């Protein structure tokens, strides 16, 4: 029934542009800057590209050709389009290298994403049928609910007081009648499990004389009831009586699309020296030294706290280009807020020299010249 | 004229307005696109081309085979279309079809990231040298920018301390 012109637009590339996703959720009860805004935690717009034959003309498959001054000259062509046509009859765009190249940097570390576990550093990947699942069915139990990562209900501890009242008066209250039916289906089994053995030596699930008989018996044990209320409202488990419920469930898939590797249990075979012990080190920046407590370091565009251990202790205007130290990325994971938290640990010494050998900056070569 | 209605108009309005106003185009995939790209925000950092070559890219898209198609790259769109197909032909649920198409997406993305590492390492075993990686190139740029900030801070710091000297009254020296 669709017209031929409308069938092409549906499959058009421009129509495939996903809607702008909400920004990384920050603390609602906190001040924020009004005008100046820095790079976000994760990208909210789609990064666009063209052929180098068309970029010379400013053609990006958009409403109008973009200016050549602000889109030509660089190596990697990347652009973000906030509005294809604004009230000023212009395409409000901006460079996309802030996030486009940060993905390439991270993926150059060759490190998978692991499931956060409170402090035997056993790492388990995210891409596993045991945990990475979203579909379910009524036979699911609470034990299996701890493996999922995508719940349809909110996290109580995270919701603000006002948001919690709206949830009760808009999602929990009108679900009273339906919840009674949920128990009827459960009590249909309460009767039939008395026939657990009647055959080895379900009813029609409508009994108002029963749903009341059950909940009144659970007022002395509030724990068993909460587990039953979570199944109906799809609430992520909170009390231990497991899947890192302290900070809440992730608002995104645990990987977040940054990197789809499953394990770092490989040994990069060096050309000459052979299989190495650790992974190649990475030079990191030093921001916000210790001496506003704590130290920060810029590791491949991401900000992670300094290693457990100097340049970090105090700020030194004498160093050129800032304090830069080599380090190895041990474990990386995504926070419940959507951020990418890297558990960074200081690197060794010999590996740094082994890396500089290929780069050529190694003042003293380890091959040949090294007598001992 | 009466514009095309891309969604059923409100059957309850007794005196509706905006009858001669074009309506919004909404497809079933719009719901799925939003759901996918929210679970994979960094999937947007992958540069995707929207410029069309000839507009005939839809003639060779048979989503019954799998995610990998002709003409289009492996993107979040391929997961949505594959999801939509299963959700319609094979009568799968939104969640079930999402898992299936989503898992096939990971296994393909993994192999692409493994090739880069194995390709470089393999090349060097036979005498293959490469240029500057994006990691080193990124740090060099930060150095040039950080230095410019050091100059500004140094200049501004001087101004503030000088202002303090002038602010304090040293008009008479005794």
């Amino acid at each position: 029934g669709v017209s031929p012109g409308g069938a092409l637009l549906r499959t058009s590339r421009m129509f495939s542009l996903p809607p702008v996703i909400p920004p990384p959720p920050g603390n609602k009860l906190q001040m924020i800057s009004e005008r100046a805004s820095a790079t976000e935690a994760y990208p909210t717009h789609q990064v666009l590209t063209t052929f180098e034959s068309s970029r010379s003309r400013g053609d990006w498959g958009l409403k109008r050709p973009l200016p050549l001054k602000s889109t030509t000259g660089t190596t990697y062509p990347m652009v973000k389009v906030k509005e294809m046509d604004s009230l000023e009859q212009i395409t409000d765009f901006t460079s996309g290298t802030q996030h486009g190249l940060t993905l390439k940097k991270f993926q150059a570390l060759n490190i998978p994403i692991s499931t956060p576990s409170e402090i035997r550093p056993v790492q388990r990947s995210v891409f596993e049928a045991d945990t990475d699942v979203t579909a379910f069915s009524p036979d699911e139990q609470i034990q299996e609910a701890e493996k999922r990562w995508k719940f349809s209900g909110p996290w109580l501890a995270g919701m603000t007081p006002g948001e919690f009242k709206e949830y009760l008066a808009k999602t929990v209250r009108p679900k009273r009648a339906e919840f009674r039916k949920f128990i009827q289906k459960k009590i249909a089994a309460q009767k039939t499990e008395a026939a657990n053995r009647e055959l080895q030596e379900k009813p029609e699930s409508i009994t108002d004389d029963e749903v009341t008989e059950y909940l009144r018996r659970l007022r002395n044990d509030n724990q068993v009831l909460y587990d039953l209320v979570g199944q109906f409202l799809d609430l992520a488990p909170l009390k231990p009586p497991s899947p890192y419920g302290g900070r809440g469930p992730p608002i995104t898939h645990p990987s977040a699309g940054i990197s789809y590797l499953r394990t770092a249990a490989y040994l990069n075979n060096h050309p000459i020296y052979g299989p190495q012990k650790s992974h190649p080190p990475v030079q990191a920046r030093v921001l916000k030294p210790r001496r506003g407590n704590d130290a920060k370091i810029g590791v491949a565009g991401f900000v992670a706290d300094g290693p457990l251990g100097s340049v970090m202790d105090k700020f030194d205007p004498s160093i050129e280009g800032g304090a830069k130290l080599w380090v190895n990325v041990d474990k990386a994971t995504v926070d419940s807020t959507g951020r990418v938290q890297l558990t960074v640990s200081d690197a060794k010494a010999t590996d740094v020299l082994i890396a500089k050998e290929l780069i050529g900056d190694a003042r003293e070569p380890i091959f040949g010249s090294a007598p001992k | 004229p009466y514009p095309i209605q891309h969604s059923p108009p409100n059957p309850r309005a007794r005196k509706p307005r905006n009858l001669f106003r074009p309506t919004k185009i909404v497809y079933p995939e719009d719901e799925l696109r939003r759901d996918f790209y929210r679970d994979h925000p960094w999937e947007l950092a992958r540069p995707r081309m929207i410029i069309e070559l000839d507009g005939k890219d839809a003639r060779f898209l048979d989503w019954s085979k799998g995610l990998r198609q002709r003409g289009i790259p492996l993107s979040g769109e391929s997961v949505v279309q594959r999801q939509l197909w299963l959700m319609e032909n094979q009568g799968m649920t939104k969640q079930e079809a999402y898992d299936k198409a989503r898992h096939e997406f990971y296994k393909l993305r993994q192999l692409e990231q493994m090739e880069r590492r194995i390709a470089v390492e393999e090349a060097r075993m036979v005498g293959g040298y490469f240029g500057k990686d994006l990691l080193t190139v990124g740090m060099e740029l930060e150095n040039k920018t950080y230095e410019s900030w050091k100059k500004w801070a140094t200049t501004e710091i001087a101004r503030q301390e000088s202002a303090r000297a002038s602010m304090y009254t040293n008009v008479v020296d005794n």
Binding site: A38, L287, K288, P289, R291, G292, K314, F315, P317 | W149, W152, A153, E156, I157
Partner: peptide, 21 residues
Amino acid sequence: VQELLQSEVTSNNYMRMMRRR
């Protein structure tokens, strides 16, 4: 030892220009 604090007297100064957390 004042040479040390004299160095920190400038460290806090530069850190005050880092208007970002």
